[PDB]
Amino acid sequence: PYSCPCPSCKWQGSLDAVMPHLMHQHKSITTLQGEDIVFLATDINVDWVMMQSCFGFHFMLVLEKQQQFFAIVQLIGTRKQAENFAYRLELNGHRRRLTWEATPRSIHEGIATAIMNSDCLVFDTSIAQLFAENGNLGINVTISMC
């Protein structure tokens, strides 16, 4: 049984019920259509969440500040479905580029475990400041099939 993928919600249910749940009860999460997008997180001085829609699926994009930053992508779907994708997270700044590429986690795997193992893009504040505008950080997120 699947739990709410948003990084104060104690909702549980089927996999097919996840998207309806997010749409009705978390109306404030923005969704973007496209396989190559910019996740522009504002005021990095905390969780930011959006959804990216492509290849007929929805991916939850999360940036968390615990200081260190963790950026991760998770498929609203099964592990089997997730294994058909690759995601890329890129920070770009003045003649510097940091890139992280992996298989998206299923929401069943959650992101606590991936975060605790630094299995995602991990960067600290000095780095965040370095790629960021005025406390705004643009992450280029690209999803592809394999």
Partner: peptide, 9 residues
């Protein structure tokens, strides 16, 4: 590319 301007929770 499309961009989403995202505020913090």
């Amino acid at each position: 590319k499309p961009a989403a301007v995202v505020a913090p929770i």
